[PDB]
Design an enzyme around this catalytic site. Structure first.
Site, PDB file in Angstrom:
ATOM      1  N   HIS A  58      26.104  -2.756  43.785  1.00 35.38           N
ATOM      2  CA  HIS A  58      26.578  -4.128  43.963  1.00 35.38           C
ATOM      3  C   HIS A  58      25.561  -5.157  43.496  1.00 35.38           C
ATOM      4  O   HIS A  58      24.573  -5.427  44.172  1.00 35.38           O
ATOM      5  CB  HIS A  58      26.945  -4.363  45.445  1.00 35.38           C
ATOM      6  CG  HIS A  58      27.713  -5.625  45.694  1.00 35.38           C
ATOM      7  ND1 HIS A  58      28.964  -5.630  46.273  1.00 35.38           N
ATOM      8  CD2 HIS A  58      27.395  -6.925  45.476  1.00 35.38           C
ATOM      9  CE1 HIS A  58      29.393  -6.874  46.384  1.00 35.38           C
ATOM     10  NE2 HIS A  58      28.460  -7.680  45.907  1.00 35.38           N
ATOM     11  N   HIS A  60      25.306  -9.071  40.984  1.00 33.61           N
ATOM     12  CA  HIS A  60      25.973 -10.102  40.188  1.00 33.61           C
ATOM     13  C   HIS A  60      25.094 -10.454  38.995  1.00 33.61           C
ATOM     14  O   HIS A  60      24.229 -11.314  39.077  1.00 33.61           O
ATOM     15  CB  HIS A  60      26.275 -11.350  41.027  1.00 33.61           C
ATOM     16  CG  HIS A  60      27.258 -11.094  42.126  1.00 33.61           C
ATOM     17  ND1 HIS A  60      28.573 -11.510  42.065  1.00 33.61           N
ATOM     18  CD2 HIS A  60      27.129 -10.426  43.298  1.00 33.61           C
ATOM     19  CE1 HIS A  60      29.205 -11.125  43.158  1.00 33.61           C
ATOM     20  NE2 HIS A  60      28.355 -10.452  43.912  1.00 33.61           N
ATOM     21  N   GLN A 153      36.103 -14.857  42.098  1.00 30.64           N
ATOM     22  CA  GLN A 153      35.237 -15.525  43.070  1.00 30.64           C
ATOM     23  C   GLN A 153      35.934 -16.617  43.873  1.00 30.64           C
ATOM     24  O   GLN A 153      35.640 -16.807  45.056  1.00 30.64           O
ATOM     25  CB  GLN A 153      34.014 -16.110  42.359  1.00 30.64           C
ATOM     26  CG  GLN A 153      33.138 -17.025  43.209  1.00 30.64           C
ATOM     27  CD  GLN A 153      32.303 -16.283  44.248  1.00 30.64           C
ATOM     28  OE1 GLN A 153      31.154 -15.905  43.991  1.00 30.64           O
ATOM     29  NE2 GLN A 153      32.869 -16.096  45.438  1.00 30.64           N
ATOM     30  N   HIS A 211      35.285  -7.709  47.755  1.00 27.08           N
ATOM     31  CA  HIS A 211      34.357  -8.456  48.617  1.00 27.08           C
ATOM     32  C   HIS A 211      35.103  -8.707  49.917  1.00 27.08           C
ATOM     33  O   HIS A 211      35.971  -9.575  49.979  1.00 27.08           O
ATOM     34  CB  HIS A 211      33.971  -9.791  47.977  1.00 27.08           C
ATOM     35  CG  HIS A 211      32.822  -9.690  47.024  1.00 27.08           C
ATOM     36  ND1 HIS A 211      32.927  -9.074  45.792  1.00 27.08           N
ATOM     37  CD2 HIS A 211      31.542 -10.114  47.129  1.00 27.08           C
ATOM     38  CE1 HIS A 211      31.757  -9.136  45.178  1.00 27.08           C
ATOM     39  NE2 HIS A 211      30.902  -9.769  45.964  1.00 27.08           N
ATOM     40  N   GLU A 214      33.265 -10.870  54.180  1.00 32.50           N
ATOM     41  CA  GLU A 214      31.876 -11.331  54.179  1.00 32.50           C
ATOM     42  C   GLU A 214      31.767 -12.659  54.929  1.00 32.50           C
ATOM     43  O   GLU A 214      31.614 -13.722  54.324  1.00 32.50           O
ATOM     44  CB  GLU A 214      31.311 -11.494  52.755  1.00 32.50           C
ATOM     45  CG  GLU A 214      29.784 -11.685  52.754  1.00 32.50           C
ATOM     46  CD  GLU A 214      29.205 -12.113  51.416  1.00 32.50           C
ATOM     47  OE1 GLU A 214      27.954 -12.197  51.310  1.00 32.50           O
ATOM     48  OE2 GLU A 214      29.984 -12.373  50.476  1.00 32.50           O
ATOM     49  N   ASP A 310      22.788  -6.837  45.639  1.00 33.76           N
ATOM     50  CA  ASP A 310      23.739  -7.957  45.587  1.00 33.76           C
ATOM     51  C   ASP A 310      23.319  -9.113  44.658  1.00 33.76           C
ATOM     52  O   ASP A 310      23.970  -9.383  43.636  1.00 33.76           O
ATOM     53  CB  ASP A 310      24.047  -8.455  47.014  1.00 33.76           C
ATOM     54  CG  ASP A 310      25.180  -9.451  47.066  1.00 33.76           C
ATOM     55  OD1 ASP A 310      25.393 -10.005  48.159  1.00 33.76           O
ATOM     56  OD2 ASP A 310      25.861  -9.689  46.045  1.00 33.76           O
TER      57      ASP A 310
HETATM   58 ZN   LIG Z   1      26.494 -11.696  47.361  1.00 33.13          ZN
HETATM   59 ZN   LIG Z   2      28.812  -9.755  45.753  1.00 29.50          ZN
END
Ligand SMILES: [Zn+2]
Ligand SMILES: [Zn+2]
Ligand SMILES: C[C@H](O)COCC(COC[C@@H](C)O)(COC[C@@H](C)O)COC[C@@H](C)O
Ligand SMILES: [Zn+2]
Length: 422
Positions: A58, A60, A153, A211, A214, A310
């Site tokens: 994971h 980005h 997102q 996702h 979270e 992450d």
């Molecule tokens: Zn994140």
């Molecule tokens: Zn993420």
């Protein structure tokens, strides 16, 4: 042309081992009678630990290295972080994305990571980062197998043309379908978004990585829909729920009921300890919750869970060197997995468990597998973790792609003494 790795330790095994290479694969693994001398065409593990490569399940890569541009995340929350990213996303260019993604990928190669799953924001009519990242995937292939998640997102239902953009990203070649149900405008949009995600994954035959919950909201239970849909379609192995930080705040009775489904469904979980400890608990005063998902309980139940980094220097996390042993270190502390055996087995959370999460087939130190492996200057998992060792060698397809000459520390007392922290 490497033909052998000598003087290698293996987790849970006695003495030293010799690993024979042939045509970029592992041909055989034989026990040694003692320390073997260096020979041409051999790589000396120096009694270090040999394991399959680290995995980053994971990250980005489209946001990496952008912290502070054009503004800093002042509150250190997920929600402001998305506001900050939206500002930066408006400034994204093709070259910008590739340059930053490659910078982090090089750190990862140096850190013995040969498998990476990156989420890329597809809430963007131009699909700039997604298209750029599809190129990076091809460019980095000799060193890292990169999976790309089409990550909506700003929501599938809650962003203009979100579903169409998500599908176009798959058509273009994204490996994994993403979602973000707790960020959708309503619970109903959240549930519906998951139905759409699973429909797309079945249409294009792709993996899923959501996702998922979270948020420090005990009512955020999208994970049960992810698991139920996976179960219904018989596709658990192809499905991952990332974060699930809301689970940290669930009552125990619901969690018990839920765990039955989680086990039956066979879905994977990713916890992101460096980011979770930073972004979760931000709406508490004192006491403050930790906010990591129920890793210890998952392990006890045989549910597959693993650790990701992450974010690396971006709107959500101002630190990082893309180092998986550092991620593991944080996870063990915050999750209180601090028994000797738990720490020693911790390597599994950044190797084998993560490989399972990425649905990898060619992974592990075994005859027949590709010669993809790393060597740590450490006696076992506990030692590697305690001393935060670098990667001595990274081998891919039987070739060395990275090496670190370990630091050398000396103290000058009554005479010079070498310090190894052992
Ligand atoms: Zn994140
Ligand atoms: Zn993420
Ligand atoms: C990020 C920094 O460390 C420089 O990397 C340049 C890099 C050049 O592209 C190579 C590709 C195969 O065409 C990556 O380097 C990896 C090579 C050496 O295999 C990527 O640069 C992106 C810009 C040019 O938009
Ligand atoms: Zn291009």
């Amino acid at each position: 042309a490497l033909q052998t790795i000598i003087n290698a330790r293996l987790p849970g095994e006695e003495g030293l081992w010799q690993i024979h290479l042939q045509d970029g694969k592992i041909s055989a693994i034989d026990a040694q009678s003692g320390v073997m001398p260096i020979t041409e065409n051999s790589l000396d593990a120096e009694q270090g630990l040999v394991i399959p490569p680290f995995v980053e399940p994971h990250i980005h890569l489209d946001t990496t290295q952008t912290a502070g541009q054009p503004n800093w995340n002042q509150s250190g929350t997920l929600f402001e972080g998305i506001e900050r990213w939206a500002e930066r996303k408006a400034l994204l260019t093709h070259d910008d994305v590739k340059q930053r993604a490659w910078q982090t990928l090089k750190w990862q190669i140096a850190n013995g990571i040969q498998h990476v799953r990156t989420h890329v924001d597809v809430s963007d009519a131009t699909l700039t980062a997604l298209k750029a990242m599809l190129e990076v995937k091809q460019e980095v292939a000799p060193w890292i197998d990169l999976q790309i998640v089409a990550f909506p997102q700003e929501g599938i239902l809650s962003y203009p043309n979100g579903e169409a953009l998500l599908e176009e990203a798959l058509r273009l070649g994204a490996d994994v379908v993403g979602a973000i149900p707790h960020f959708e405008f309503t619970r109903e949009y959240g549930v519906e978004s998951l139905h759409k995600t699973f429909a797309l994954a079945q249409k294009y035959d792709r993996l899923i990585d959501v996702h998922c919950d979270e948020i420090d909201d005990e009512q955020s239970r999208f994970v049960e829909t992810v698991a139920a849909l996976a179960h219904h379609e018989g596709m658990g192995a192809r499905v991952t729920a990332s974060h699930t930080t809301a689970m940290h705040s669930y009552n125990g009775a619901y969690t018990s009921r839920l765990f039955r489904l989680l086990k039956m469904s066979g879905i994977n979980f990713v916890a992101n300890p460096l980011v979770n400890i930073h972004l979760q608990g931000r709406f508490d005063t004192y006491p403050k919750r930790r906010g990591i998902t129920r890793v210890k309980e998952m392990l006890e139940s045989g549910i597959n869970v693993c650790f990701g980094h992450d974010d690396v220097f971006d709107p959500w996390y101002p630190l990082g060197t893309a180092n998986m042993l550092q991620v593991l270190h944080m996870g063990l502390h915050v999750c209180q997995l601090m028994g000797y055996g738990q720490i020693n087995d911790g390597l599994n959370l950044i190797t084998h468990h993560s490989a399972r999460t990425l649905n990898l087939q060619d992974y592990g130190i075994a005859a027949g597998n590709s010669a993809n492996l790393i060597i740590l200057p450490a006696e076992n998992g506990f030692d590697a973790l305690r001393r935060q060792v670098p990667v001595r060698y990274s081998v891919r397809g039987g070739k060395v792609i990275a090496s670190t000459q370990p630091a050398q520390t000396t103290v000058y007392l009554e005479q010079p003494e070498a310090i190894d922290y052992k």
